Design a protein around this ligand. Sequence first.
Ligand SMILES: CCCCCCCCCCCCCCCCCC(=O)OC[C@H](COP(=O)(O)OCCN)OC(=O)CCCCCCCCCCCCCCCCC
Ligand SMILES: CCCCCCCCCCCCCCCCCC(=O)OC[C@H](COP(=O)(O)OCCN)OC(=O)CCCCCCCCCCCCCCCCC
Lengths: 96, 78, 114, 176, 63, 88, 459, 11, 125, 102, 156
Amino acid sequence: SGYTPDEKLRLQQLRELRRRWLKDQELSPREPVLPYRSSLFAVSHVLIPMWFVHYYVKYHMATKPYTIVSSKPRIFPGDTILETGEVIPPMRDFPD
Amino acid sequence: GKMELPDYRQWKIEGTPLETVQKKLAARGLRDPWARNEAWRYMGGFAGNITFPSVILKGFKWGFAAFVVALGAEYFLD
Amino acid sequence: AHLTRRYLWDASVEPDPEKIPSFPPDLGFPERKERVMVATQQEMMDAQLTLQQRDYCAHYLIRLLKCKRDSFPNFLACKHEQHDWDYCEHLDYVKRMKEFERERRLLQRKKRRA
Amino acid sequence: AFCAPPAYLTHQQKVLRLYKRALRHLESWCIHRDKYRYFACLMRARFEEHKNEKDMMRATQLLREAEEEFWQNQHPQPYIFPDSPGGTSFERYECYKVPEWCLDYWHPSEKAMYPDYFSKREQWKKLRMESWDREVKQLQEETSPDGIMTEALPPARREGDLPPLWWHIVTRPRER
Amino acid sequence: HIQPRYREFPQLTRSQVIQGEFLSSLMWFWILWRFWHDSDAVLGHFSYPDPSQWTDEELGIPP
Amino acid sequence: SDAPPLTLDGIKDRVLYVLKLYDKIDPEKLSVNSHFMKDLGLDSLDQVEIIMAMEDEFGFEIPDIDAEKLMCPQEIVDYIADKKDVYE
Amino acid sequence: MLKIILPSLMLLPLTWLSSPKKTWTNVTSYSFLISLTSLTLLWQTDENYKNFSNMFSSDPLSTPLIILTAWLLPLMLMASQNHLKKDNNVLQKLYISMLISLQILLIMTFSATELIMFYILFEATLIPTLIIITRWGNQTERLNAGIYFLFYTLIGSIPLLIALILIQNHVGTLNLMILSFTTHTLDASWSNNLLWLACMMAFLIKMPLYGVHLWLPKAHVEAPIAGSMILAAILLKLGSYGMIRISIILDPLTKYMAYPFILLSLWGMIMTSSICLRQTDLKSLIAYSSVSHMALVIASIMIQTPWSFMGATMLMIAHGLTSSLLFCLANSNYERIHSRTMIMARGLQMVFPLMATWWLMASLANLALPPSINLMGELFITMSLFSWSNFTIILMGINIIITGMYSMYMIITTQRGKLTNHMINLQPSHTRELTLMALHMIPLILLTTSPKLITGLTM
Amino acid sequence: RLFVVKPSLYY
Amino acid sequence: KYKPAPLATLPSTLDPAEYDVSPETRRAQVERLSIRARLKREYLLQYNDPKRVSHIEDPALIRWTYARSANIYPNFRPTPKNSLLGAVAGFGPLIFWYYVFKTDRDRKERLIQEGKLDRKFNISY
Amino acid sequence: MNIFTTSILLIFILLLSPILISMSNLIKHINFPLYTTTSIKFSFIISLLPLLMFFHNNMEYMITTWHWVTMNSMELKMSFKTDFFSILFTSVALFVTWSIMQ
Amino acid sequence: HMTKDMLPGSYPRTPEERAAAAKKYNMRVEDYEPYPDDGMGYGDYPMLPNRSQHERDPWYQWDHSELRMNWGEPIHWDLDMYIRNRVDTSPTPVSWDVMCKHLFGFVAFMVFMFWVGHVFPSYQPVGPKQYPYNNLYLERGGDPTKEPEPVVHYDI
Ligand SMILES: CCCCCCCCCCCCCCCCCC(=O)OC[C@H](COP(=O)(O)OCCN)OC(=O)CCCCCCCCCCCCCCCCC
Ligand SMILES: CCCCCCCCCCCCCCCCCC(=O)OC[C@H](COP(=O)(O)OCCN)OC(=O)CCCCCCCCCCCCCCCCC
């Protein structure tokens, strides 16, 4: 059994009221009232920070003993070191 | 913008698996009142069977073509 | 495979992976030579290798790392070296397989001696 | 979401809802439309086979057996439309469904924009403090003095009167 | 921008199809280049010798 | 990719469209108020199927308690409008 | 120290002969200036401690308690302001005077050198608290709550006094650091065991042991917000200070006369963290949270290790701040809804979108989100108890889990559902209470940045 | 274009 | 066939209480619905009522909190299984944990006394 | 040892910047999504370099930045271990979060 | 404001009490059933079905929606565990007795088969690897001044 006539009238009234509430929730124009890029971004978001960071490192992180501890660089036969003008000799005859 | 709706005088069961289903439901003695709705698909731009080859070997034509081109260029340059 | 031959057939005449050098080495080898090492401890330690990696082929691995650090911006220029290292590792694997087969044959000897 | 269940569902309603759920689970099981139509027609034949029957006891028995068959043959991961319970959007915009009274606390410099909006909101209240007293009498006077009562509501029988208890069915937020 | 379509196959721009075709063709070009130059990596480059094909001289076993 | 809003005439078009596609009774003669039992003589089972087709068309469910009361395309359109909050 | 106490004593006339419109403002501003001046105590350039007189002294353990005490005052002033707003000028001046007296007595008992002065002040802290709880509560069980509080405390405190006399007689002084430079070992006899029990039960009650925790939830639930804050922050710390100071002479008894309390603490931790899952009153939930947190402090004092004491101090201060914050957050709603029931109001974070952050961070702390001093304390307590015995980690993990559960429960049943749209009386958030929450949080950030001021005696 | 209800946020 | 459980309850379909048409069933249903509707009407005469500045109360919620909080001891009665549950829950686990910790501590201490332990790098506690 | 560490900490400075504009008043006068996406983009471009220097040298670094506490023979400090895993995962995750932000 | 006549009380031992209790809790004196008298504080509080809030109707426009519970309805003593963010008693196609059995069986069989594969492992036919300098005795910790137990690795 469908909507009784009282229910139908109820729904029609609530419908004509909601379709007015929404039309009112709409709003007029003129409201709400109110009273190169790559390079500039690069500068102002990389360089300045990079300057500050280089300062911090060079003068508060390398002046201290064990703050920047690099591993040792791989060395192979023939690689002539430069801090002593040295040369390590090559390997043995490879069987084949 | 105002929307349109095409005529319902074109969505027909003929020439689709809906027709075979109708054959079966007739063999059993029945009818389907809705097939014309589902028949908007199965015809038109949506028509045709897609295959696992169809989806996997997409681009393969020009892929192989450019592959052979680069192979010949490599043989040239030695 | 050895799996079946051990877990279903005679399990006592098939070797055990953890006891391969069990028998004496020269039971069939006169003046059995040693496996040589043509890479020096220092030559291998100054290169910062890894202890799973400074095996009998660390010399070709050293050449590989060298030819890689050099010619770097252009990778793929370390194929002739990579092949050599892969080959030496394959030959080591072959020697291991042959040790396995040796020990299985010696198990055959022990089961045929009685 | 707009009405209230009756004190008890009738055999008709039970059977209809069983049919609907059975068809939804048939859809879940059969992914293709041809298959769905085939087996839906089969199921409707199974149903119509017992539409002109009237023995209430045998009917209730058939129903008690069909519900068990359904529980035994139901898809355990059925299709639920997103915005419906069990769906991936049920109660998703309740975060933005802010009520209307939250504007009575706004600051003059906030309603200074949208001035044409708030003027309407005002007279929508004038339409409420007047339409309130007569909405009670219409309930008082339309009361069943025999005790019986249910969750229904009447419309207004006049020119100017409004349905009793409207402010919350009206004024409710969009769904979006 | 586009116009919705109802119960029909919509209008298809050219970019969204050409770009997909390009990506697929590039993937297959890569697969082919590789399978040509480095086939071993999926097939093999170091055979598996047949056990017992050796000689008792090697892997010495006395009689 | 946002889909367009709804309209009352659009819902009317779509509903009458589905009902025209329907075959069991509807002889392609459907006014907005073609009651299913009185004007067309349908069954509650056919009504169930009709509501399910409306759902498969619009993308949402109709609770059974409220679908047991829809017998006219106009009632269907009104329920759908109340649910989707149309005609702002 | 007198430069800290004399102005606190002068805040009283200011309060009484200030006009009915500027008393709040003036007393709050000057309380803030007192909090500022109290930082002289942090000028500790050597391992030697401060001694201004025969009657006063400061340590790395008493300084933070003192500064937190001088800081909480203006916050309590601000928080007790919306209520008792209609109440008469005289009544609200009385309230302010109660607060100030609590401040002064707590500063004194943290800066004291003699156990008996510590005692008279740790027992004079009752009058103002009882008066605040009974004269400004809203329910009818605040009377029974005050009874419970008062009498638990006194029943625990009498034998402490008797033990102090016994000591003052055996030794000739009750002075600290003399009781240290002259302490002797004991005989492990029953008389000395009962001496231990006496010295301890007062503090084990003032910081709720599991079995005698039946005065804290009452007092909180029935007390106003300033009472709740001070009770949660400092009155639960008097016991810790007292035990850290009195455990030096009871050696070597606590090696075996401490097991029962370690057990009770490690178990009641779980058995209260669980109540925090099924309690309906937000205030009682937070009370049981305080209990589950003070259990760690107890168990860490009992084992007497440097890491343990460090964690005890860190967690003391951190929990003080966090509990005050949570209490004030619940009060913000109570002032708007007049119901401590948590599940009543829901779906906030929609109309109060910012206070939902303060709600969240106070929860991130309570569940020990790093980097935070709550965790820098819990972790070290856990390590100390793991060295004690490795099987404590089980109960520690259980408590961690339950904490992470009930914190987010408290968050979600209030701020992360959908709104009770029938709540017309949700007056927007006051700048005053937003400032309360900010003043609670920011110091936690700063103490997390510089936790060297918070380790304690050992470190 | 429509109106989105919101709390104050000014306070 | 579906075996119901206290954690996977029985549905409404398979509940023979449903499909019951006895008047002693339908009348009860109608009365329950009448009560429900009376309460809903009462509550909606307060929700939408203008001139309402405050919120709505929930006497049911108040009753529930009062029962779960303060109506406990006035109805408490010592009984068997009650004294026993209390004593066990209170003491048993404490004894268990006490013996665990004591065994561990004693073992550790005797090990250390004998010197049979390795405390390498332990310089914090 | 100046370029590596600077490039390691610069990505953190960058990632932080958006959240700093999130507390400022510029949000309502900026395109925060585009700005954050560009920040992520430049963070990825920066992280690309340490990857090159590692692939070249295979050198790992330890970088202690700030002293937090000293607890009786137990220090705690901010310490970054730039190794293969870290420097590669950083690049991958940034390259992905870029796409994800867009 | 409330009153001792509106609030709960003690166990009803007469229908004169059951009537008032049920009319207060807003139930009917038949459906109302108090908790047994085991001295546990319950008193006259309703004993209601141990069903969760998932079972209820989602399509109904309730008053307390997140709880799915009306205004004056009597509240379940164990709501805090059925508030729908928690325990779910809603039914299941499969049944407890069979689902528990299936899960336990899957887990236990998989564990047993892990142990079977541990007893009978899988491997490849090769000998152990060989590292020259006494399995790298020096590098691998070792001790420089002392000497290792020398080991040899032969060819083939
Ligand atoms: C609801 C709870 C119950 C409330 C009612 C309380 C009833 C009170 C109990 C009745 C009185 C029994 C206590 C009698 C005290 C006996 C004297 C004594 O124990 O002192 C011994 C010890 C000093 O001895 P020592 O220095 O070694 O040499 C000899 C003396 N020059 O010095 C001491 O040890 C001081 C001992 C003081 C008494 C301690 C009481 C027990 C302490 C633990 C529990 C505290 C909680 C309150 C009491 C609970 C019930 C005991
Ligand atoms: C070979 C190995 C094989 C075996 C490996 C075994 C590994 C150990 C497994 C332990 C984990 C099992 C216990 C986990 C509890 C999870 C509880 C939970 O899931 O809470 C969420 C739950 C709702 O979730 P759900 O059922 O999915 O509902 C979705 C509806 N669409 O419902 C809730 O919302 C409840 C919210 C929290 C309730 C309070 C919980 C209190 C804490 C009790 C759990 C912790 C107990 C310790 C678990 C073991 C760890 C020691």
